mmCIF file with all atom_site columns, C-alpha atoms and ligand atoms in Angstrom:
data_model
loop_
_atom_site.group_PDB
_atom_site.id
_atom_site.type_symbol
_atom_site.label_atom_id
_atom_site.label_alt_id
_atom_site.label_comp_id
_atom_site.label_asym_id
_atom_site.label_entity_id
_atom_site.label_seq_id
_atom_site.pdbx_PDB_ins_code
_atom_site.Cartn_x
_atom_site.Cartn_y
_atom_site.Cartn_z
_atom_site.occupancy
_atom_site.B_iso_or_equiv
_atom_site.pdbx_formal_charge
_atom_site.auth_seq_id
_atom_site.auth_comp_id
_atom_site.auth_asym_id
_atom_site.auth_atom_id
_atom_site.pdbx_PDB_model_num
ATOM   1   C CA  . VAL M 1 1   ? 47.969 8.690   33.359 1.00 57.54 ? 1   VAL M CA  1
ATOM   2   C CA  . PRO M 1 2   ? 47.795 12.455  32.419 1.00 55.74 ? 2   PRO M CA  1
ATOM   3   C CA  . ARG M 1 3   ? 45.666 14.835  34.555 1.00 58.06 ? 3   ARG M CA  1
ATOM   4   C CA  . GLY M 1 4   ? 42.625 16.143  32.682 1.00 58.59 ? 4   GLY M CA  1
ATOM   5   C CA  . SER M 1 5   ? 42.247 12.752  31.000 1.00 60.14 ? 5   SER M CA  1
ATOM   6   C CA  . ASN M 1 6   ? 38.769 12.184  32.467 1.00 61.44 ? 6   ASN M CA  1
ATOM   7   C CA  . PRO M 1 7   ? 35.986 14.091  30.729 1.00 61.87 ? 7   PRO M CA  1
ATOM   8   C CA  . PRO M 1 8   ? 33.189 15.516  32.841 1.00 62.15 ? 8   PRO M CA  1
ATOM   9   C CA  . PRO M 1 9   ? 30.490 12.906  33.480 1.00 63.78 ? 9   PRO M CA  1
ATOM   10  C CA  . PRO M 1 10  ? 27.513 12.808  31.184 1.00 65.98 ? 10  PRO M CA  1
ATOM   11  C CA  . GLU M 1 11  ? 24.736 15.370  31.635 1.00 66.59 ? 11  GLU M CA  1
ATOM   12  C CA  . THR M 1 12  ? 22.029 14.165  34.043 1.00 70.18 ? 12  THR M CA  1
ATOM   13  C CA  . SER M 1 13  ? 19.754 17.217  34.567 1.00 68.43 ? 13  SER M CA  1
ATOM   14  C CA  . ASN M 1 14  ? 18.473 19.655  31.973 1.00 67.20 ? 14  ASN M CA  1
ATOM   15  C CA  . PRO M 1 15  ? 15.765 22.019  33.317 1.00 66.62 ? 15  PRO M CA  1
ATOM   16  C CA  . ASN M 1 16  ? 14.946 23.024  29.695 1.00 66.62 ? 16  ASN M CA  1
ATOM   17  C CA  . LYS M 1 17  ? 13.703 19.492  28.885 1.00 69.42 ? 17  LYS M CA  1
ATOM   18  C CA  . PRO M 1 18  ? 10.012 18.784  29.580 1.00 65.85 ? 18  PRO M CA  1
ATOM   19  C CA  . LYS M 1 19  ? 9.218  16.238  32.251 1.00 65.74 ? 19  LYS M CA  1
ATOM   20  C CA  . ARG M 1 20  ? 6.630  13.484  32.660 1.00 68.73 ? 20  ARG M CA  1
ATOM   21  C CA  . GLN M 1 21  ? 6.160  10.491  34.960 1.00 66.02 ? 21  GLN M CA  1
ATOM   22  C CA  . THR M 1 22  ? 5.385  7.274   33.106 1.00 68.82 ? 22  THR M CA  1
ATOM   23  C CA  . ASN M 1 23  ? 4.706  3.715   34.361 1.00 70.38 ? 23  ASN M CA  1
ATOM   24  C CA  . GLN M 1 24  ? 7.528  2.558   32.007 1.00 67.95 ? 24  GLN M CA  1
ATOM   25  C CA  . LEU M 1 25  ? 10.097 5.104   33.287 1.00 67.34 ? 25  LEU M CA  1
ATOM   26  C CA  . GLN M 1 26  ? 9.034  4.226   36.815 1.00 65.45 ? 26  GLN M CA  1
ATOM   27  C CA  . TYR M 1 27  ? 9.606  0.523   36.059 1.00 62.04 ? 27  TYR M CA  1
ATOM   28  C CA  . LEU M 1 28  ? 13.041 1.293   34.599 1.00 63.40 ? 28  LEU M CA  1
ATOM   29  C CA  . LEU M 1 29  ? 14.072 3.010   37.834 1.00 61.85 ? 29  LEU M CA  1
ATOM   30  C CA  . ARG M 1 30  ? 12.336 0.967   40.534 1.00 60.33 ? 30  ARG M CA  1
ATOM   31  C CA  . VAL M 1 31  ? 12.794 -2.498  38.979 1.00 61.28 ? 31  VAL M CA  1
ATOM   32  C CA  . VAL M 1 32  ? 15.348 -2.565  36.149 1.00 60.50 ? 32  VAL M CA  1
ATOM   33  C CA  . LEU M 1 33  ? 18.070 -0.257  37.511 1.00 61.46 ? 33  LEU M CA  1
ATOM   34  C CA  . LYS M 1 34  ? 17.539 -1.683  41.045 1.00 61.91 ? 34  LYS M CA  1
ATOM   35  C CA  . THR M 1 35  ? 17.988 -5.261  39.866 1.00 62.90 ? 35  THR M CA  1
ATOM   36  C CA  . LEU M 1 36  ? 21.122 -4.558  37.795 1.00 62.94 ? 36  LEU M CA  1
ATOM   37  C CA  . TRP M 1 37  ? 22.612 -2.347  40.507 1.00 62.87 ? 37  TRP M CA  1
ATOM   38  C CA  . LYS M 1 38  ? 22.543 -5.197  42.978 1.00 65.37 ? 38  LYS M CA  1
ATOM   39  C CA  . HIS M 1 39  ? 24.037 -7.823  40.615 1.00 65.46 ? 39  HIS M CA  1
ATOM   40  C CA  . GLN M 1 40  ? 27.297 -9.479  41.613 1.00 65.90 ? 40  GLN M CA  1
ATOM   41  C CA  . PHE M 1 41  ? 28.995 -8.065  38.452 1.00 62.18 ? 41  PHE M CA  1
ATOM   42  C CA  . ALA M 1 42  ? 27.563 -4.503  38.736 1.00 61.37 ? 42  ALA M CA  1
ATOM   43  C CA  . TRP M 1 43  ? 30.467 -2.720  40.495 1.00 57.26 ? 43  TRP M CA  1
ATOM   44  C CA  . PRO M 1 44  ? 32.543 -1.676  37.362 1.00 58.58 ? 44  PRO M CA  1
ATOM   45  C CA  . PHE M 1 45  ? 29.349 -0.351  35.674 1.00 61.69 ? 45  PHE M CA  1
ATOM   46  C CA  . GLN M 1 46  ? 28.109 1.815   38.586 1.00 61.10 ? 46  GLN M CA  1
ATOM   47  C CA  . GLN M 1 47  ? 30.065 5.027   37.841 1.00 60.31 ? 47  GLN M CA  1
ATOM   48  C CA  . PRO M 1 48  ? 31.803 6.688   34.902 1.00 61.83 ? 48  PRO M CA  1
ATOM   49  C CA  . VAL M 1 49  ? 35.023 5.013   33.871 1.00 61.31 ? 49  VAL M CA  1
ATOM   50  C CA  . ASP M 1 50  ? 37.790 6.786   35.736 1.00 60.66 ? 50  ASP M CA  1
ATOM   51  C CA  . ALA M 1 51  ? 40.590 6.401   33.235 1.00 61.96 ? 51  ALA M CA  1
ATOM   52  C CA  . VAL M 1 52  ? 43.219 7.846   35.607 1.00 61.44 ? 52  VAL M CA  1
ATOM   53  C CA  . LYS M 1 53  ? 42.485 5.773   38.740 1.00 63.98 ? 53  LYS M CA  1
ATOM   54  C CA  . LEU M 1 54  ? 41.838 2.554   36.739 1.00 64.03 ? 54  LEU M CA  1
ATOM   55  C CA  . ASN M 1 55  ? 44.879 3.065   34.497 1.00 59.61 ? 55  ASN M CA  1
ATOM   56  C CA  . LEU M 1 56  ? 42.989 3.063   31.187 1.00 61.88 ? 56  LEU M CA  1
ATOM   57  C CA  . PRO M 1 57  ? 44.765 5.882   29.355 1.00 60.67 ? 57  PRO M CA  1
ATOM   58  C CA  . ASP M 1 58  ? 43.180 5.283   25.911 1.00 60.15 ? 58  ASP M CA  1
ATOM   59  C CA  . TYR M 1 59  ? 39.572 4.737   27.134 1.00 57.35 ? 59  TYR M CA  1
ATOM   60  C CA  . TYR M 1 60  ? 38.237 8.150   26.080 1.00 61.65 ? 60  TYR M CA  1
ATOM   61  C CA  . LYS M 1 61  ? 40.373 8.101   22.932 1.00 61.18 ? 61  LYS M CA  1
ATOM   62  C CA  . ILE M 1 62  ? 38.262 5.112   21.866 1.00 61.98 ? 62  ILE M CA  1
ATOM   63  C CA  . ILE M 1 63  ? 34.928 5.618   23.630 1.00 62.42 ? 63  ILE M CA  1
ATOM   64  C CA  . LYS M 1 64  ? 33.221 8.910   22.699 1.00 62.94 ? 64  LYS M CA  1
ATOM   65  C CA  . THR M 1 65  ? 29.720 8.068   24.074 1.00 64.84 ? 65  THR M CA  1
ATOM   66  C CA  . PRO M 1 66  ? 30.479 6.885   27.599 1.00 59.01 ? 66  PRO M CA  1
ATOM   67  C CA  . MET M 1 67  ? 27.596 5.660   29.731 1.00 57.20 ? 67  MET M CA  1
ATOM   68  C CA  . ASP M 1 68  ? 27.232 4.002   33.111 1.00 54.54 ? 68  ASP M CA  1
ATOM   69  C CA  . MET M 1 69  ? 24.446 3.012   35.520 1.00 54.27 ? 69  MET M CA  1
ATOM   70  C CA  . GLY M 1 70  ? 25.191 5.893   37.940 1.00 51.71 ? 70  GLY M CA  1
ATOM   71  C CA  . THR M 1 71  ? 24.424 8.351   35.111 1.00 52.98 ? 71  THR M CA  1
ATOM   72  C CA  . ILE M 1 72  ? 21.290 6.409   34.179 1.00 51.57 ? 72  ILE M CA  1
ATOM   73  C CA  . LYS M 1 73  ? 20.027 6.437   37.791 1.00 52.23 ? 73  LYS M CA  1
ATOM   74  C CA  . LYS M 1 74  ? 20.491 10.219  37.921 1.00 54.57 ? 74  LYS M CA  1
ATOM   75  C CA  . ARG M 1 75  ? 18.855 10.693  34.519 1.00 53.50 ? 75  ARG M CA  1
ATOM   76  C CA  . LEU M 1 76  ? 15.752 8.731   35.654 1.00 56.39 ? 76  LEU M CA  1
ATOM   77  C CA  . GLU M 1 77  ? 15.644 10.657  38.973 1.00 55.31 ? 77  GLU M CA  1
ATOM   78  C CA  . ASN M 1 78  ? 15.846 14.013  37.254 1.00 54.43 ? 78  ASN M CA  1
ATOM   79  C CA  . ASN M 1 79  ? 13.202 13.143  34.642 1.00 56.30 ? 79  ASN M CA  1
ATOM   80  C CA  . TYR M 1 80  ? 15.800 13.501  31.922 1.00 55.54 ? 80  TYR M CA  1
ATOM   81  C CA  . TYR M 1 81  ? 14.124 10.957  29.677 1.00 53.91 ? 81  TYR M CA  1
ATOM   82  C CA  . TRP M 1 82  ? 10.783 11.672  28.000 1.00 56.17 ? 82  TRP M CA  1
ATOM   83  C CA  . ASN M 1 83  ? 10.412 8.027   26.967 1.00 57.98 ? 83  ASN M CA  1
ATOM   84  C CA  . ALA M 1 84  ? 11.555 4.556   28.054 1.00 56.60 ? 84  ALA M CA  1
ATOM   85  C CA  . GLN M 1 85  ? 13.367 3.989   24.754 1.00 58.12 ? 85  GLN M CA  1
ATOM   86  C CA  . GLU M 1 86  ? 15.842 6.841   25.463 1.00 59.89 ? 86  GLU M CA  1
ATOM   87  C CA  . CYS M 1 87  ? 16.739 5.120   28.729 1.00 56.32 ? 87  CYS M CA  1
ATOM   88  C CA  . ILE M 1 88  ? 16.997 1.652   27.094 1.00 57.00 ? 88  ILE M CA  1
ATOM   89  C CA  . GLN M 1 89  ? 19.379 3.188   24.517 1.00 56.90 ? 89  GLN M CA  1
ATOM   90  C CA  . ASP M 1 90  ? 21.666 4.427   27.375 1.00 55.57 ? 90  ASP M CA  1
ATOM   91  C CA  . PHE M 1 91  ? 21.811 0.878   28.784 1.00 53.35 ? 91  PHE M CA  1
ATOM   92  C CA  . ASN M 1 92  ? 22.599 -0.481  25.284 1.00 53.57 ? 92  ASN M CA  1
ATOM   93  C CA  . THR M 1 93  ? 25.335 2.145   24.874 1.00 57.23 ? 93  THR M CA  1
ATOM   94  C CA  . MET M 1 94  ? 26.896 1.099   28.166 1.00 56.62 ? 94  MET M CA  1
ATOM   95  C CA  . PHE M 1 95  ? 27.090 -2.543  27.062 1.00 60.31 ? 95  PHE M CA  1
ATOM   96  C CA  . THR M 1 96  ? 28.244 -1.706  23.522 1.00 58.45 ? 96  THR M CA  1
ATOM   97  C CA  . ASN M 1 97  ? 31.041 0.537   24.868 1.00 58.49 ? 97  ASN M CA  1
ATOM   98  C CA  . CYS M 1 98  ? 32.411 -2.445  26.822 1.00 55.97 ? 98  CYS M CA  1
ATOM   99  C CA  . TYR M 1 99  ? 32.276 -4.674  23.714 1.00 55.87 ? 99  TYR M CA  1
ATOM   100 C CA  . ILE M 1 100 ? 34.113 -2.026  21.646 1.00 53.12 ? 100 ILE M CA  1
ATOM   101 C CA  . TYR M 1 101 ? 36.850 -1.160  24.076 1.00 54.77 ? 101 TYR M CA  1
ATOM   102 C CA  . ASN M 1 102 ? 37.568 -4.711  25.262 1.00 57.59 ? 102 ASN M CA  1
ATOM   103 C CA  . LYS M 1 103 ? 38.739 -7.894  23.602 1.00 57.22 ? 103 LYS M CA  1
ATOM   104 C CA  . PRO M 1 104 ? 35.959 -10.441 23.144 1.00 58.33 ? 104 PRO M CA  1
ATOM   105 C CA  . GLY M 1 105 ? 35.810 -12.976 25.956 1.00 57.07 ? 105 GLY M CA  1
ATOM   106 C CA  . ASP M 1 106 ? 37.755 -10.775 28.388 1.00 61.57 ? 106 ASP M CA  1
ATOM   107 C CA  . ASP M 1 107 ? 36.512 -10.881 32.014 1.00 63.14 ? 107 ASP M CA  1
ATOM   108 C CA  . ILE M 1 108 ? 34.823 -7.401  31.866 1.00 63.82 ? 108 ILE M CA  1
ATOM   109 C CA  . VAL M 1 109 ? 33.014 -8.519  28.670 1.00 65.10 ? 109 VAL M CA  1
ATOM   110 C CA  . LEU M 1 110 ? 31.648 -11.674 30.309 1.00 63.68 ? 110 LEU M CA  1
ATOM   111 C CA  . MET M 1 111 ? 30.487 -9.447  33.211 1.00 63.13 ? 111 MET M CA  1
ATOM   112 C CA  . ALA M 1 112 ? 28.752 -7.082  30.736 1.00 63.25 ? 112 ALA M CA  1
ATOM   113 C CA  . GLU M 1 113 ? 27.164 -10.024 28.878 1.00 60.02 ? 113 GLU M CA  1
ATOM   114 C CA  . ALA M 1 114 ? 25.637 -11.422 32.044 1.00 62.95 ? 114 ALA M CA  1
ATOM   115 C CA  . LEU M 1 115 ? 24.219 -7.992  33.007 1.00 63.86 ? 115 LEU M CA  1
ATOM   116 C CA  . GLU M 1 116 ? 22.914 -7.417  29.489 1.00 61.88 ? 116 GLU M CA  1
ATOM   117 C CA  . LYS M 1 117 ? 21.043 -10.749 29.483 1.00 58.98 ? 117 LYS M CA  1
ATOM   118 C CA  . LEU M 1 118 ? 19.438 -9.840  32.827 1.00 56.96 ? 118 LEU M CA  1
ATOM   119 C CA  . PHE M 1 119 ? 18.607 -6.365  31.487 1.00 59.35 ? 119 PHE M CA  1
ATOM   120 C CA  . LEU M 1 120 ? 16.914 -7.798  28.393 1.00 55.00 ? 120 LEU M CA  1
ATOM   121 C CA  . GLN M 1 121 ? 14.994 -10.260 30.593 1.00 57.01 ? 121 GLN M CA  1
ATOM   122 C CA  . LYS M 1 122 ? 13.648 -7.410  32.715 1.00 57.03 ? 122 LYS M CA  1
ATOM   123 C CA  . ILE M 1 123 ? 12.936 -5.232  29.655 1.00 58.94 ? 123 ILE M CA  1
ATOM   124 C CA  . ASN M 1 124 ? 10.619 -7.978  28.314 1.00 56.72 ? 124 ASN M CA  1
ATOM   125 C CA  . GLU M 1 125 ? 8.335  -7.340  31.336 1.00 54.77 ? 125 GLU M CA  1
ATOM   126 C CA  . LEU M 1 126 ? 8.096  -3.594  30.495 1.00 56.51 ? 126 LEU M CA  1
ATOM   127 C CA  . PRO M 1 127 ? 4.437  -2.589  31.109 1.00 54.63 ? 127 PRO M CA  1
ATOM   128 C CA  . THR M 1 128 ? 2.045  -0.936  28.643 1.00 57.47 ? 128 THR M CA  1
HETATM 129 C C1  . JFU C 2 .   ? 41.013 -12.672 44.013 1.00 53.94 ? 1   JFU C C1  1
HETATM 130 C C2  . JFU C 2 .   ? 40.142 -13.864 43.859 1.00 53.94 ? 1   JFU C C2  1
HETATM 131 N N1  . JFU C 2 .   ? 39.624 -13.939 42.429 1.00 53.94 ? 1   JFU C N1  1
HETATM 132 C C3  . JFU C 2 .   ? 40.187 -14.580 41.382 1.00 53.94 ? 1   JFU C C3  1
HETATM 133 O O1  . JFU C 2 .   ? 41.276 -15.208 41.463 1.00 53.94 ? 1   JFU C O1  1
HETATM 134 C C4  . JFU C 2 .   ? 39.346 -14.468 40.290 1.00 53.94 ? 1   JFU C C4  1
HETATM 135 C C5  . JFU C 2 .   ? 39.327 -14.869 39.005 1.00 53.94 ? 1   JFU C C5  1
HETATM 136 C C6  . JFU C 2 .   ? 38.240 -14.556 38.141 1.00 53.94 ? 1   JFU C C6  1
HETATM 137 N N2  . JFU C 2 .   ? 38.185 -14.913 36.815 1.00 53.94 ? 1   JFU C N2  1
HETATM 138 C C7  . JFU C 2 .   ? 39.408 -15.192 36.020 1.00 53.94 ? 1   JFU C C7  1
HETATM 139 C C8  . JFU C 2 .   ? 39.059 -16.094 34.844 1.00 53.94 ? 1   JFU C C8  1
HETATM 140 N N3  . JFU C 2 .   ? 38.013 -15.555 33.933 1.00 53.94 ? 1   JFU C N3  1
HETATM 141 C C9  . JFU C 2 .   ? 37.645 -16.468 32.852 1.00 53.94 ? 1   JFU C C9  1
HETATM 142 C C10 . JFU C 2 .   ? 36.824 -15.570 34.816 1.00 53.94 ? 1   JFU C C10 1
HETATM 143 C C11 . JFU C 2 .   ? 36.948 -14.662 35.994 1.00 53.94 ? 1   JFU C C11 1
HETATM 144 N N4  . JFU C 2 .   ? 37.227 -13.812 38.655 1.00 53.94 ? 1   JFU C N4  1
HETATM 145 C C12 . JFU C 2 .   ? 37.230 -13.402 39.961 1.00 53.94 ? 1   JFU C C12 1
HETATM 146 C C13 . JFU C 2 .   ? 36.230 -12.608 40.546 1.00 53.94 ? 1   JFU C C13 1
HETATM 147 N N5  . JFU C 2 .   ? 35.152 -12.265 39.807 1.00 53.94 ? 1   JFU C N5  1
HETATM 148 S S1  . JFU C 2 .   ? 34.757 -10.726 39.452 1.00 53.94 ? 1   JFU C S1  1
HETATM 149 O O2  . JFU C 2 .   ? 34.511 -9.907  40.715 1.00 53.94 ? 1   JFU C O2  1
HETATM 150 O O3  . JFU C 2 .   ? 33.617 -10.704 38.433 1.00 53.94 ? 1   JFU C O3  1
HETATM 151 C C14 . JFU C 2 .   ? 36.236 -10.066 38.685 1.00 53.94 ? 1   JFU C C14 1
HETATM 152 C C15 . JFU C 2 .   ? 36.947 -9.079  39.349 1.00 53.94 ? 1   JFU C C15 1
HETATM 153 C C16 . JFU C 2 .   ? 38.104 -8.580  38.811 1.00 53.94 ? 1   JFU C C16 1
HETATM 154 C C17 . JFU C 2 .   ? 38.565 -9.073  37.574 1.00 53.94 ? 1   JFU C C17 1
HETATM 155 F F1  . JFU C 2 .   ? 39.675 -8.590  37.029 1.00 53.94 ? 1   JFU C F1  1
HETATM 156 C C18 . JFU C 2 .   ? 37.850 -10.048 36.913 1.00 53.94 ? 1   JFU C C18 1
HETATM 157 C C19 . JFU C 2 .   ? 36.681 -10.552 37.476 1.00 53.94 ? 1   JFU C C19 1
HETATM 158 F F2  . JFU C 2 .   ? 35.996 -11.505 36.808 1.00 53.94 ? 1   JFU C F2  1
HETATM 159 C C20 . JFU C 2 .   ? 36.373 -12.274 41.914 1.00 53.94 ? 1   JFU C C20 1
HETATM 160 C C21 . JFU C 2 .   ? 37.507 -12.671 42.614 1.00 53.94 ? 1   JFU C C21 1
HETATM 161 C C22 . JFU C 2 .   ? 38.467 -13.411 42.017 1.00 53.94 ? 1   JFU C C22 1
HETATM 162 C C23 . JFU C 2 .   ? 38.304 -13.738 40.731 1.00 53.94 ? 1   JFU C C23 1
HETATM 163 C C1  . JFU C 2 .   ? 32.505 -1.247  32.230 1.00 55.31 ? 2   JFU C C1  1
HETATM 164 C C2  . JFU C 2 .   ? 33.564 -0.159  32.032 1.00 55.31 ? 2   JFU C C2  1
HETATM 165 N N1  . JFU C 2 .   ? 34.934 -0.723  32.065 1.00 55.31 ? 2   JFU C N1  1
HETATM 166 C C3  . JFU C 2 .   ? 35.695 -1.244  31.081 1.00 55.31 ? 2   JFU C C3  1
HETATM 167 O O1  . JFU C 2 .   ? 35.326 -1.309  29.900 1.00 55.31 ? 2   JFU C O1  1
HETATM 168 C C4  . JFU C 2 .   ? 36.885 -1.673  31.602 1.00 55.31 ? 2   JFU C C4  1
HETATM 169 C C5  . JFU C 2 .   ? 38.022 -2.269  31.149 1.00 55.31 ? 2   JFU C C5  1
HETATM 170 C C6  . JFU C 2 .   ? 39.097 -2.537  32.057 1.00 55.31 ? 2   JFU C C6  1
HETATM 171 N N2  . JFU C 2 .   ? 40.274 -3.143  31.701 1.00 55.31 ? 2   JFU C N2  1
HETATM 172 C C7  . JFU C 2 .   ? 40.397 -3.933  30.500 1.00 55.31 ? 2   JFU C C7  1
HETATM 173 C C8  . JFU C 2 .   ? 41.839 -3.973  30.029 1.00 55.31 ? 2   JFU C C8  1
HETATM 174 N N3  . JFU C 2 .   ? 42.728 -4.562  31.014 1.00 55.31 ? 2   JFU C N3  1
HETATM 175 C C9  . JFU C 2 .   ? 44.083 -4.688  30.519 1.00 55.31 ? 2   JFU C C9  1
HETATM 176 C C10 . JFU C 2 .   ? 42.755 -3.517  32.071 1.00 55.31 ? 2   JFU C C10 1
HETATM 177 C C11 . JFU C 2 .   ? 41.369 -3.280  32.689 1.00 55.31 ? 2   JFU C C11 1
HETATM 178 N N4  . JFU C 2 .   ? 38.935 -2.237  33.370 1.00 55.31 ? 2   JFU C N4  1
HETATM 179 C C12 . JFU C 2 .   ? 37.804 -1.633  33.823 1.00 55.31 ? 2   JFU C C12 1
HETATM 180 C C13 . JFU C 2 .   ? 37.563 -1.298  35.164 1.00 55.31 ? 2   JFU C C13 1
HETATM 181 N N5  . JFU C 2 .   ? 38.542 -1.528  36.095 1.00 55.31 ? 2   JFU C N5  1
HETATM 182 S S1  . JFU C 2 .   ? 38.308 -2.632  37.296 1.00 55.31 ? 2   JFU C S1  1
HETATM 183 O O2  . JFU C 2 .   ? 36.994 -2.328  37.984 1.00 55.31 ? 2   JFU C O2  1
HETATM 184 O O3  . JFU C 2 .   ? 39.505 -2.693  38.234 1.00 55.31 ? 2   JFU C O3  1
HETATM 185 C C14 . JFU C 2 .   ? 38.104 -4.182  36.507 1.00 55.31 ? 2   JFU C C14 1
HETATM 186 C C15 . JFU C 2 .   ? 36.891 -4.830  36.604 1.00 55.31 ? 2   JFU C C15 1
HETATM 187 C C16 . JFU C 2 .   ? 36.686 -6.035  35.968 1.00 55.31 ? 2   JFU C C16 1
HETATM 188 C C17 . JFU C 2 .   ? 37.696 -6.606  35.234 1.00 55.31 ? 2   JFU C C17 1
HETATM 189 F F1  . JFU C 2 .   ? 37.449 -7.721  34.637 1.00 55.31 ? 2   JFU C F1  1
HETATM 190 C C18 . JFU C 2 .   ? 38.917 -5.985  35.139 1.00 55.31 ? 2   JFU C C18 1
HETATM 191 C C19 . JFU C 2 .   ? 39.129 -4.764  35.778 1.00 55.31 ? 2   JFU C C19 1
HETATM 192 F F2  . JFU C 2 .   ? 40.289 -4.145  35.706 1.00 55.31 ? 2   JFU C F2  1
HETATM 193 C C20 . JFU C 2 .   ? 36.338 -0.689  35.492 1.00 55.31 ? 2   JFU C C20 1
HETATM 194 C C21 . JFU C 2 .   ? 35.384 -0.463  34.480 1.00 55.31 ? 2   JFU C C21 1
HETATM 195 C C22 . JFU C 2 .   ? 35.643 -0.821  33.210 1.00 55.31 ? 2   JFU C C22 1
HETATM 196 C C23 . JFU C 2 .   ? 36.813 -1.386  32.914 1.00 55.31 ? 2   JFU C C23 1
#
């Protein structure tokens, strides 16, 4: 697994971007991320895919918009998102990446599918 194969992690802090605190963004961090973080299948989704350590040499040849819940946590914390939808899109990207890279019905896919169902359940309680 060649050195330099991992990209830098996604950007999580941009001081140029304006910042606001929103009941929806607060819900995404305090409820949604918390609940998914603690799920029995969360571990593989908690940090950027380390292609070297996990022996996935073609990951970043295939996946050009990587996303993970560690990145999302940091983005919420740093007020990276102006609206809830930007954050929801990062979650969707994380699940879609798994469905692109992996064969349907593989173990990691079933793990993603369970998390995604829980995510969508929690998203339906998103406040006004
Ligand atoms: C070492 C004991 N063990 C198994 O033999 C085993 C099989 C297993 N399967 C294989 C069959 N597939 C349809 C369902 C998940 N999941 C987990 C499992 N579930 S898990 O943490 O979501 C998981 C971890 C690694 C992995 F490669 C696949 C997994 F589903 C934990 C522990 C075990 C397993
Ligand atoms: C969610 C991001 N992601 C993947 O899309 C992914 C695929 C993956 N594969 C699939 C191909 N297979 C031959 C090797 C491992 N391993 C891990 C992986 N390695 S792992 O934690 O040892 C692991 C977890 C669950 C599992 F079912 C199999 C694993 F190898 C971590 C994270 C990911 C993966």
